[PDB]
Design a protein around this ligand. Sequence first.
Ligand code: NXL
Length: 250
Amino acid sequence: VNIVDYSDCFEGISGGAIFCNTKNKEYNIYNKELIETRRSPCSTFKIVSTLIGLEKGVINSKESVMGYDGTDYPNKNWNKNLSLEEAFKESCVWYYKKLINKVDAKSVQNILDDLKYGNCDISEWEGDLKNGKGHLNGFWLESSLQISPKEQVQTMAKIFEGDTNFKKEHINILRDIMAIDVNDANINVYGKTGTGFDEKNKRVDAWFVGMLEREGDTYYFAIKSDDSNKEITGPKVKEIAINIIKKYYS
Ligand SMILES: *C(=O)N1C[C@H](NOS(=O)(=O)O)CC[C@H]1C(N)=O
């Protein structure tokens, strides 16, 4: 466990980062207190909910559809019978809500327990209804489920090193749709952003979680902001993560 200083890449935004290489058990931590604090995963939960849907047969491949019903949404890409790959990349809430609501709560509880997914608290299945957004909510969106950045990395490592019971074919579908382009062919980066606002504490929950493969070694990472500036989003923290990767992990 090496404490590191990545502040220069955070451009004055408050947050922290953790990178773990499981071959040599090298844990690099910036802002240890934040890295151990549990927070709502927001859209980073799509990493796990995709695997749940695959395991239960609700979806089967990166082409799988969830039967769009014609409901009007402001994001033009949500207004179609989109595939799993497009729903993941466009963060289509209705698709992932419909997916999870086809799965019984016991099954979800047991999968989260097996993954040690933070507090594994799905008690508020419907999510944070007081925000007025009705069915666009759920337990993983600023609600009962909370996970620390360190626990995110531990979960990613267990999934993608083959240490869970999820099928290898399903893990590879996730890998496929998580891959991003960082304009550097010499590193493979995979990840997912998440964005929420913590109304109790008036701070953002802005995430980028994933992995990086660079010539033999693999690092699992979580970058997290808790800034009070509402302009700080998941996509903003992904930019910060990319800067760290290129500066320190290239
Ligand atoms: C997940 O965090 N969400 C879904 C959607 N996309 O998030 S992302 O841009 O961070 O990937 C919008 C934000 C958030 C939500 N409001 O549900």
